[PDB]
Amino acid sequence: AEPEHDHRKRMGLKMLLMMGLLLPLVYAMKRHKWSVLKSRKLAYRPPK
Amino acid sequence: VAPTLTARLYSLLFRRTSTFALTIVVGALFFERAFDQGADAIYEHINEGKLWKHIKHKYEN
Amino acid sequence: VSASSRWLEGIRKWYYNAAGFNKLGLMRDDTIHENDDVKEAIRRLPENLYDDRVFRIKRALDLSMRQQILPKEQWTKYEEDKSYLEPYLKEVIRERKEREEWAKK
Amino acid sequence: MLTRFLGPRYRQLARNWVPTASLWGAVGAVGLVWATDWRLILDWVPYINGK
Amino acid sequence: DEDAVPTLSPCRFTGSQICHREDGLPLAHVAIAVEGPGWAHPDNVALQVANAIIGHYDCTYGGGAHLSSPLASIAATNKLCQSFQTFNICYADTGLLGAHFVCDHMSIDDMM
């Protein structure tokens, strides 16, 4: 029914180990560029 | 050596977007080897005798 | 004068706290949907109320971005909540409804 | 009609962008080498001849 | 003399942004800088040259399109500001090296 079986599970392991590197790294890449915005401090200074 | 090495990396390899790109490309070739090695070998070790790569010796020539 | 109208008030104060715009320093009039009637009443706001309004919203969208909330101290007390827009908004709709009756004859 | 571009400044400015342009072909070829698995070249590389 | 004369501490450069937004004012002032080496350093001479090449502009400058400086030329042709100036302020062991300008609200990007 499914000769690809062991080939697909092999790619799956890679997919799992690859995502396991990339997801933290892509996250670390976003977290960086938003770090400017995430730590910005507002002050309002109107007259009187 | 253990602190001033991210530094050494950056000067030599990361400043120039050429050497940056060269590093990622040179670095990717070496990674594709080491990964398709290691992970295939991880995948080997989790079956150990389910696969025709191990059976091979049974039916000779 | 009344036990029960203090209760409708307690229901109202509940829903207010429950809505939780307060939690991001907002006032009820900061939260209103901008339609044409609303848009104009913002136009009509005096300098200070306008500048205060832009700051409240700016502070809130900032919190909303960082998924946070004010100190409970710094939230907007239900009683302390001024319907600064109300009279303007009412005057706008009032003017529009006039134009609408005139358009009918 | 490219007579315009022949003078001292232009040769300084080419001479400026030369080490960069050098490395950009290094990037581009080695990428093509890796992406096609060029066989002919890659046999030379220790480690990477996995056969 | 003898008691509690201290030397200056070194000053940490951040690199960082301060934006004080006020649309009631008719033109924008931006001032951008990287960190300078300060008074002593031979690099001041060379930086000052590079600065000189970028130079300065002002809308009262005689003859605009034909200015040597590619900043100042494009600035004048495309009416991209009212003023700019390069600078290198020195302190002991540090300083501010960059430029400051002044322009319309729709120039701030192009000028940048």
Side-chain angles (χ1 to χ4, degrees):
Chain A
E2 199 202 59
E4 66 259 24
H5 186 277
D6 317 326
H7 203 198
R8 52 152 272 255
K9 280 170 170 167
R10 187 205 241 92
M11 316 220 296
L13 174 87
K14 282 136 169 242
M15 198 275 292
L16 291 183
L17 268 144
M18 256 326 171
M19 242 46 145
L21 192 93
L22 293 193
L23 265 152
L25 290 168
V26 181
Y27 198 38
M29 259 183 111
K30 131 113 165 135
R31 226 54 158 56
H32 177 262
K33 296 222 157 302
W34 288 78
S35 95
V36 175
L37 269 169
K38 299 272 164 129
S39 49
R40 76 176 172 179
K41 334 247 75 160
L42 296 215
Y44 181 34
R45 274 182 72 81
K48 150 179 245 255
Chain B
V1 223
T4 172
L5 186 119
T6 32
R8 230 215 254 102
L9 245 57
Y10 171 72
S11 272
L12 237 106
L13 261 69
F14 287 100
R15 199 153 217 232
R16 233 190 218 89
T17 326
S18 5
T19 60
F20 188 79
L22 182 86
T23 287
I24 97 97
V25 148
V26 160
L29 193 47
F30 274 115
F31 190 84
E32 203 204 7
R33 174 101 196 103
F35 197 74
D36 277 355
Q37 220 197 6
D40 267 58
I42 301 313
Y43 183 65
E44 264 123 56
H45 199 63
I46 218 257
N47 303 288
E48 248 199 278
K50 274 164 209 162
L51 292 141
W52 168 251
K53 217 227 107 199
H54 324 111
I55 279 162
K56 223 208 129 126
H57 70 265
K58 251 112 188 130
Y59 336 111
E60 211 263 285
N61 203 235
Chain C
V1 219
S2 26
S4 65
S5 254
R6 204 216 124 247
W7 178 256
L8 183 94
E9 216 61 35
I11 291 167
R12 278 157 176 192
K13 198 192 146 144
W14 170 75
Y15 183 78
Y16 183 91
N17 254 85
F21 39 93
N22 32 294
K23 283 215 203 114
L24 318 150
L26 297 167
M27 280 191 223
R28 187 209 55 179
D29 284 352
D30 310 352
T31 53
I32 219 304
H33 192 5
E34 279 196 41
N35 55 45
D36 288 352
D37 298 0
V38 167
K39 235 141 138 127
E40 172 65 16
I42 341 242
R43 219 192 62 69
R44 274 123 173 262
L45 291 167
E47 180 77 346
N48 76 109
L49 300 169
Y50 182 87
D51 298 327
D52 285 345
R53 184 213 229 251
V54 348
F55 189 58
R56 271 183 259 107
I57 315 167
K58 211 177 168 309
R59 196 224 272 121
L61 301 157
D62 171 71
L63 294 144
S64 175
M65 168 220 104
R66 42 187 202 77
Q67 299 280 199
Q68 269 261 227
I69 231 82
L70 296 200
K72 215 181 149 177
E73 332 133 47
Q74 262 191 74
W75 299 0
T76 86
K77 330 241 162 136
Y78 166 77
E79 43 274 334
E80 260 153 56
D81 188 286
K82 359 219 120 222
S83 335
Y84 57 85
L85 234 162
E86 196 111 89
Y88 302 102
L89 226 209
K90 189 179 132 141
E91 191 42 45
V92 175
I93 300 147
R94 198 261 210 95
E95 308 183 326
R96 175 165 63 66
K97 297 231 149 285
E98 191 172 29
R99 281 176 250 140
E100 258 149 59
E101 305 308 299
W102 260 91
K104 282 159 166 210
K105 5 207 246 70
Chain D
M1 274 265 101
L2 289 149
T3 216
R4 196 177 166 159
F5 301 98
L6 332 143
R9 189 191 151 243
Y10 298 100
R11 70 208 255 281
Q12 277 129 235
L13 177 96
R15 272 156 208 266
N16 281 169
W17 286 111
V18 121
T20 254
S22 122
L23 298 150
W24 234 281
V27 173
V30 174
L32 166 68
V33 166
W34 159 100
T36 54
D37 272 306
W38 232 215
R39 34 169 233 215
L40 175 67
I41 302 108
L42 284 170
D43 274 279
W44 231 241
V45 201
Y47 223 107
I48 282 144
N49 38 240
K51 285 257 111 176
Chain E
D1 53 70
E2 208 170 288
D3 227 302
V5 185
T7 334
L8 283 172
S9 68
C11 290
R12 202 252 323 278
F13 188 88
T14 303
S16 45
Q17 199 180 238
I18 175 158
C19 293
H20 173 179
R21 152 96 144 284
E22 217 297 71
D23 294 12
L25 308 186
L27 311 136
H29 283 51
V30 182
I32 178 136
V34 312
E35 204 216 307
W39 290 114
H41 210 298
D43 285 3
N44 279 317
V45 188
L47 276 170
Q48 283 290 172
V49 178
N51 262 180
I53 297 168
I54 313 214
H56 43 49
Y57 179 70
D58 178 80
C59 64
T60 78
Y61 279 17
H66 308 142
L67 290 153
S68 292
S69 155
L71 216 178
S73 158
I74 284 146
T77 354
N78 301 268
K79 284 119 135 235
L80 276 196
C81 84
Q82 234 45 226
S83 110
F84 78 90
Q85 52 169 329
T86 53
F87 62 88
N88 173 40
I89 311 152
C90 296
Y91 308 103
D93 312 285
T94 188
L96 290 163
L97 162 99
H100 138 85
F101 61 82
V102 167
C103 61
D104 189 75
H105 77 122
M106 319 292 269
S107 283
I108 308 161
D109 196 273
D110 286 327
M111 199 57 179
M112 194 68 218

Short mmCIF file of all heavy atoms in Angstrom, two decimals, chain D residues 7-49:
data_model
loop_
_atom_site.label_atom_id
_atom_site.label_comp_id
_atom_site.label_asym_id
_atom_site.label_seq_id
_atom_site.Cartn_x
_atom_site.Cartn_y
_atom_site.Cartn_z
N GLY D 7 38.35 56.94 -17.34
CA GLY D 7 39.17 57.96 -16.69
C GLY D 7 39.74 57.50 -15.36
O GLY D 7 39.23 56.52 -14.81
N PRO D 8 40.72 58.24 -14.80
CA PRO D 8 41.36 57.89 -13.52
C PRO D 8 40.42 57.44 -12.42
O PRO D 8 40.61 56.33 -11.91
CB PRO D 8 42.05 59.20 -13.09
CG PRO D 8 41.65 60.21 -14.09
CD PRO D 8 41.28 59.48 -15.35
N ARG D 9 39.35 58.20 -12.18
CA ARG D 9 38.38 57.89 -11.13
C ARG D 9 37.76 56.51 -11.32
O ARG D 9 37.72 55.70 -10.39
CB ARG D 9 37.30 58.98 -11.04
CG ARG D 9 36.36 58.88 -9.87
CD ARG D 9 35.17 59.79 -9.96
NE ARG D 9 34.02 59.23 -9.26
CZ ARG D 9 32.87 58.88 -9.82
NH1 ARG D 9 32.61 59.11 -11.11
NH2 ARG D 9 31.95 58.28 -9.07
N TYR D 10 37.36 56.22 -12.56
CA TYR D 10 36.67 54.98 -12.88
C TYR D 10 37.55 53.76 -12.61
O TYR D 10 37.11 52.83 -11.92
CB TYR D 10 36.10 55.00 -14.29
CG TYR D 10 35.06 56.08 -14.50
CD1 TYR D 10 35.39 57.28 -15.12
CD2 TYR D 10 33.74 55.93 -14.02
CE1 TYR D 10 34.44 58.31 -15.30
CE2 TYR D 10 32.77 56.94 -14.22
CZ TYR D 10 33.14 58.13 -14.84
OH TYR D 10 32.23 59.15 -15.06
N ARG D 11 38.83 53.88 -12.93
CA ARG D 11 39.77 52.81 -12.64
C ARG D 11 40.10 52.62 -11.17
O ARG D 11 40.12 51.47 -10.71
CB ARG D 11 40.98 52.77 -13.58
CG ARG D 11 41.99 53.87 -13.44
CD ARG D 11 42.74 54.18 -14.74
NE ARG D 11 44.10 53.64 -14.69
CZ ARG D 11 45.12 54.21 -14.05
NH1 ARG D 11 44.97 55.37 -13.42
NH2 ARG D 11 46.31 53.61 -14.08
N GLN D 12 40.10 53.72 -10.41
CA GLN D 12 40.18 53.69 -8.94
C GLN D 12 39.00 52.94 -8.36
O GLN D 12 39.17 52.11 -7.46
CB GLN D 12 40.14 55.10 -8.36
CG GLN D 12 41.43 55.86 -8.32
CD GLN D 12 41.30 57.24 -8.93
OE1 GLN D 12 42.05 57.57 -9.84
NE2 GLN D 12 40.42 58.08 -8.39
N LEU D 13 37.81 53.21 -8.91
CA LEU D 13 36.55 52.73 -8.38
C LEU D 13 36.27 51.27 -8.76
O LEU D 13 35.72 50.52 -7.95
CB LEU D 13 35.43 53.67 -8.82
CG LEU D 13 33.98 53.35 -8.45
CD1 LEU D 13 33.53 54.07 -7.18
CD2 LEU D 13 33.06 53.68 -9.62
N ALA D 14 36.65 50.86 -9.96
CA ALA D 14 36.80 49.44 -10.29
C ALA D 14 37.81 48.69 -9.39
O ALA D 14 37.46 47.65 -8.82
CB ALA D 14 37.15 49.25 -11.76
N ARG D 15 39.01 49.26 -9.23
CA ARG D 15 40.06 48.72 -8.35
C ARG D 15 39.62 48.58 -6.90
O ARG D 15 40.19 47.78 -6.15
CB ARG D 15 41.33 49.59 -8.39
CG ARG D 15 42.34 49.24 -9.48
CD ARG D 15 43.26 50.39 -9.90
NE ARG D 15 43.72 50.26 -11.30
CZ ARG D 15 44.86 49.70 -11.68
NH1 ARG D 15 45.70 49.18 -10.80
NH2 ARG D 15 45.17 49.68 -12.98
N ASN D 16 38.66 49.44 -6.51
CA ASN D 16 37.97 49.39 -5.21
C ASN D 16 37.05 48.19 -5.04
O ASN D 16 37.03 47.59 -3.97
CB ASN D 16 37.14 50.66 -5.00
CG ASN D 16 37.97 51.83 -4.54
OD1 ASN D 16 37.47 52.96 -4.53
ND2 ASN D 16 39.23 51.60 -4.21
N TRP D 17 36.24 47.93 -6.07
CA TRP D 17 35.22 46.88 -6.07
C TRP D 17 35.73 45.54 -6.61
O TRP D 17 34.94 44.63 -6.89
CB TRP D 17 33.99 47.33 -6.87
CG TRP D 17 33.12 48.35 -6.20
CD1 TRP D 17 32.96 49.66 -6.58
CD2 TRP D 17 32.19 48.14 -5.13
NE1 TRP D 17 32.01 50.27 -5.80
CE2 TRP D 17 31.54 49.37 -4.88
CE3 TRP D 17 31.88 47.04 -4.31
CZ2 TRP D 17 30.58 49.53 -3.87
CZ3 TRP D 17 30.93 47.20 -3.30
CH2 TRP D 17 30.29 48.44 -3.10
N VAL D 18 37.05 45.40 -6.75
CA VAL D 18 37.61 44.14 -7.22
C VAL D 18 37.69 42.94 -6.26
O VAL D 18 37.16 41.87 -6.61
CB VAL D 18 38.71 44.27 -8.32
CG1 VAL D 18 40.07 43.65 -7.92
CG2 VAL D 18 38.20 43.69 -9.64
N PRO D 19 38.23 43.11 -5.04
CA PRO D 19 38.20 42.02 -4.05
C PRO D 19 36.78 41.54 -3.76
O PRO D 19 36.55 40.33 -3.75
CB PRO D 19 38.84 42.65 -2.81
CG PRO D 19 39.72 43.72 -3.34
CD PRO D 19 38.96 44.28 -4.51
N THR D 20 35.82 42.47 -3.72
CA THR D 20 34.42 42.11 -3.54
C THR D 20 33.90 41.23 -4.68
O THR D 20 33.48 40.10 -4.43
CB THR D 20 33.54 43.34 -3.13
OG1 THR D 20 33.20 43.24 -1.74
CG2 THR D 20 32.17 43.36 -3.83
N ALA D 21 34.16 41.65 -5.92
CA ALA D 21 33.62 40.97 -7.10
C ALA D 21 34.25 39.59 -7.31
O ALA D 21 33.57 38.66 -7.76
CB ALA D 21 33.80 41.84 -8.34
N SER D 22 35.55 39.49 -7.02
CA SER D 22 36.29 38.25 -6.78
C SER D 22 35.49 37.27 -5.89
O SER D 22 34.99 36.27 -6.39
CB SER D 22 37.65 38.54 -6.16
OG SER D 22 37.79 37.87 -4.91
N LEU D 23 35.21 37.68 -4.66
CA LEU D 23 34.48 36.85 -3.69
C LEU D 23 33.04 36.48 -4.08
O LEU D 23 32.51 35.48 -3.61
CB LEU D 23 34.49 37.49 -2.30
CG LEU D 23 35.83 37.69 -1.61
CD1 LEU D 23 35.77 38.91 -0.70
CD2 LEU D 23 36.25 36.46 -0.82
N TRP D 24 32.42 37.30 -4.93
CA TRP D 24 31.03 37.08 -5.33
C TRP D 24 30.87 35.94 -6.33
O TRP D 24 29.87 35.23 -6.31
CB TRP D 24 30.36 38.38 -5.80
CG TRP D 24 29.09 38.62 -5.05
CD1 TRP D 24 27.88 38.01 -5.28
CD2 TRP D 24 28.95 39.30 -3.80
NE1 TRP D 24 27.00 38.28 -4.26
CE2 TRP D 24 27.63 39.06 -3.33
CE3 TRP D 24 29.80 40.09 -3.02
CZ2 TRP D 24 27.15 39.58 -2.13
CZ3 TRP D 24 29.31 40.64 -1.86
CH2 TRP D 24 28.02 40.35 -1.40
N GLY D 25 31.89 35.75 -7.17
CA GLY D 25 32.03 34.56 -7.99
C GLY D 25 32.43 33.31 -7.22
O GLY D 25 32.00 32.21 -7.58
N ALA D 26 33.29 33.46 -6.20
CA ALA D 26 33.51 32.41 -5.20
C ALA D 26 32.21 31.90 -4.54
O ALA D 26 31.89 30.72 -4.66
CB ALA D 26 34.54 32.85 -4.17
N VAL D 27 31.38 32.82 -4.05
CA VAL D 27 30.02 32.52 -3.57
C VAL D 27 29.17 31.79 -4.61
O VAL D 27 28.57 30.75 -4.31
CB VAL D 27 29.29 33.81 -3.03
CG1 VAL D 27 27.81 33.54 -2.68
CG2 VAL D 27 29.99 34.37 -1.80
N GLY D 28 29.17 32.29 -5.85
CA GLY D 28 28.20 31.89 -6.85
C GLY D 28 28.46 30.51 -7.43
O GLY D 28 27.52 29.75 -7.67
N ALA D 29 29.74 30.21 -7.64
CA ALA D 29 30.19 28.94 -8.22
C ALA D 29 30.08 27.78 -7.22
O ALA D 29 29.50 26.74 -7.52
CB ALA D 29 31.64 29.07 -8.75
N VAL D 30 30.62 28.01 -6.02
CA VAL D 30 30.64 27.04 -4.93
C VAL D 30 29.21 26.66 -4.53
O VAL D 30 28.94 25.49 -4.27
CB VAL D 30 31.50 27.57 -3.74
CG1 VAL D 30 31.43 26.67 -2.51
CG2 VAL D 30 32.95 27.74 -4.19
N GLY D 31 28.30 27.62 -4.60
CA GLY D 31 26.87 27.39 -4.52
C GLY D 31 26.32 26.51 -5.64
O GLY D 31 25.58 25.57 -5.34
N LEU D 32 26.70 26.79 -6.88
CA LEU D 32 26.35 25.94 -8.03
C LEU D 32 26.98 24.55 -7.93
O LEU D 32 26.35 23.56 -8.32
CB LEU D 32 26.69 26.63 -9.37
CG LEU D 32 26.74 25.91 -10.73
CD1 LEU D 32 25.38 25.43 -11.21
CD2 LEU D 32 27.37 26.78 -11.80
N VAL D 33 28.21 24.48 -7.41
CA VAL D 33 28.93 23.23 -7.15
C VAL D 33 28.13 22.34 -6.18
O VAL D 33 27.68 21.26 -6.55
CB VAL D 33 30.40 23.51 -6.65
CG1 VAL D 33 31.06 22.29 -6.05
CG2 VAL D 33 31.27 24.02 -7.79
N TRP D 34 27.81 22.92 -5.02
CA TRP D 34 26.99 22.31 -3.99
C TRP D 34 25.56 21.98 -4.44
O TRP D 34 25.13 20.85 -4.25
CB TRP D 34 27.03 23.20 -2.74
CG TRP D 34 25.93 23.07 -1.72
CD1 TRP D 34 26.00 22.37 -0.56
CD2 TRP D 34 24.73 23.86 -1.64
NE1 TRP D 34 24.87 22.58 0.20
CE2 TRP D 34 24.07 23.50 -0.44
CE3 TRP D 34 24.09 24.76 -2.50
CZ2 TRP D 34 22.81 23.99 -0.08
CZ3 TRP D 34 22.84 25.27 -2.14
CH2 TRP D 34 22.21 24.89 -0.93
N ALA D 35 24.90 22.90 -5.15
CA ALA D 35 23.50 22.68 -5.56
C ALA D 35 23.30 21.62 -6.64
O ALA D 35 22.27 20.95 -6.65
CB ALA D 35 22.80 23.98 -5.93
N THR D 36 24.30 21.43 -7.51
CA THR D 36 24.24 20.38 -8.53
C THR D 36 24.96 19.08 -8.12
O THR D 36 24.71 18.02 -8.72
CB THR D 36 24.72 20.87 -9.93
OG1 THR D 36 26.02 21.47 -9.82
CG2 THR D 36 23.81 21.99 -10.47
N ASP D 37 25.66 19.15 -6.99
CA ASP D 37 26.63 18.15 -6.53
C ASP D 37 27.61 17.80 -7.65
O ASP D 37 27.59 16.67 -8.17
CB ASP D 37 25.96 16.89 -5.94
CG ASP D 37 25.66 17.02 -4.45
OD1 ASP D 37 26.57 17.32 -3.65
OD2 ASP D 37 24.54 16.76 -3.96
N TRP D 38 28.37 18.80 -8.10
CA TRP D 38 29.28 18.64 -9.23
C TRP D 38 30.50 17.80 -8.83
O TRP D 38 31.54 18.35 -8.44
CB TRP D 38 29.71 20.00 -9.77
CG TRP D 38 29.52 20.15 -11.25
CD1 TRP D 38 30.31 20.84 -12.12
CD2 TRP D 38 28.46 19.59 -12.04
NE1 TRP D 38 29.81 20.75 -13.39
CE2 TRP D 38 28.67 19.99 -13.37
CE3 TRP D 38 27.35 18.80 -11.74
CZ2 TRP D 38 27.83 19.62 -14.40
CZ3 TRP D 38 26.50 18.43 -12.77
CH2 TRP D 38 26.75 18.84 -14.09
N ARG D 39 30.19 16.53 -8.58
CA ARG D 39 30.93 15.36 -9.06
C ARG D 39 32.37 15.62 -9.50
O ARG D 39 33.29 15.43 -8.71
CB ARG D 39 30.12 14.55 -10.10
CG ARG D 39 29.21 15.36 -11.03
CD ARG D 39 28.63 14.60 -12.19
NE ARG D 39 28.88 15.29 -13.46
CZ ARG D 39 28.05 15.31 -14.50
NH1 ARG D 39 26.84 14.76 -14.44
NH2 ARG D 39 28.42 15.91 -15.63
N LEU D 40 32.53 16.20 -10.69
CA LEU D 40 33.82 16.53 -11.28
C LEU D 40 34.72 17.34 -10.33
O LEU D 40 35.86 16.93 -10.07
CB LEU D 40 33.63 17.24 -12.63
CG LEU D 40 34.79 17.81 -13.46
CD1 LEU D 40 35.71 16.72 -14.01
CD2 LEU D 40 34.23 18.67 -14.58
N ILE D 41 34.16 18.40 -9.74
CA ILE D 41 34.89 19.24 -8.78
C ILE D 41 35.04 18.59 -7.40
O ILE D 41 36.16 18.44 -6.89
CB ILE D 41 34.30 20.68 -8.71
CG1 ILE D 41 34.32 21.35 -10.09
CG2 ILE D 41 35.10 21.56 -7.75
CD1 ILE D 41 32.95 21.51 -10.74
N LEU D 42 33.92 18.10 -6.86
CA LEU D 42 33.81 17.73 -5.45
C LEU D 42 34.66 16.54 -4.96
O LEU D 42 34.97 16.46 -3.77
CB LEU D 42 32.34 17.54 -5.06
CG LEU D 42 31.46 18.77 -4.84
CD1 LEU D 42 30.01 18.33 -4.70
CD2 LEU D 42 31.88 19.59 -3.62
N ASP D 43 35.02 15.65 -5.89
CA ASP D 43 36.05 14.60 -5.69
C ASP D 43 37.37 15.12 -5.09
O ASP D 43 38.02 14.40 -4.32
CB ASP D 43 36.34 13.88 -7.01
CG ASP D 43 35.38 12.72 -7.29
OD1 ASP D 43 35.58 11.62 -6.73
OD2 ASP D 43 34.50 12.76 -8.17
N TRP D 44 37.74 16.35 -5.44
CA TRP D 44 38.92 17.04 -4.91
C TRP D 44 38.84 17.38 -3.42
O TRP D 44 39.87 17.43 -2.74
CB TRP D 44 39.21 18.31 -5.71
CG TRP D 44 40.64 18.45 -6.20
CD1 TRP D 44 41.52 19.45 -5.89
CD2 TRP D 44 41.31 17.60 -7.14
NE1 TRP D 44 42.71 19.26 -6.55
CE2 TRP D 44 42.61 18.13 -7.33
CE3 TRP D 44 40.96 16.43 -7.85
CZ2 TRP D 44 43.57 17.54 -8.18
CZ3 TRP D 44 41.91 15.83 -8.68
CH2 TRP D 44 43.20 16.39 -8.84
N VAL D 45 37.62 17.59 -2.92
CA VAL D 45 37.37 18.05 -1.55
C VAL D 45 37.41 16.89 -0.53
O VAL D 45 36.53 16.01 -0.58
CB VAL D 45 36.02 18.84 -1.42
CG1 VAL D 45 36.02 19.74 -0.18
CG2 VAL D 45 35.73 19.66 -2.68
N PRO D 46 38.38 16.89 0.39
CA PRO D 46 38.41 15.92 1.50
C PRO D 46 37.22 16.10 2.45
O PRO D 46 36.73 17.23 2.58
CB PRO D 46 39.73 16.24 2.22
CG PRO D 46 40.54 16.98 1.21
CD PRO D 46 39.54 17.81 0.46
N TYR D 47 36.81 15.02 3.11
CA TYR D 47 35.49 14.87 3.75
C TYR D 47 34.32 14.64 2.79
O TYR D 47 33.61 13.65 2.94
CB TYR D 47 35.19 15.98 4.77
CG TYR D 47 34.57 15.52 6.06
CD1 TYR D 47 35.32 15.50 7.25
CD2 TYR D 47 33.21 15.20 6.14
CE1 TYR D 47 34.74 15.10 8.47
CE2 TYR D 47 32.61 14.81 7.34
CZ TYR D 47 33.39 14.76 8.50
OH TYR D 47 32.82 14.35 9.69
N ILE D 48 34.17 15.49 1.77
CA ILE D 48 32.89 15.69 1.07
C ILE D 48 32.59 14.68 -0.05
O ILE D 48 31.42 14.43 -0.36
CB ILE D 48 32.68 17.19 0.66
CG1 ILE D 48 32.23 18.00 1.88
CG2 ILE D 48 31.66 17.38 -0.48
CD1 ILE D 48 32.78 19.42 1.92
N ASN D 49 33.64 14.05 -0.60
CA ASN D 49 33.49 12.86 -1.45
C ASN D 49 32.92 11.63 -0.72
O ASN D 49 33.67 10.80 -0.19
CB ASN D 49 34.80 12.53 -2.18
CG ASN D 49 36.04 12.77 -1.32
OD1 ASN D 49 36.90 13.58 -1.68
ND2 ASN D 49 36.17 12.03 -0.22
#
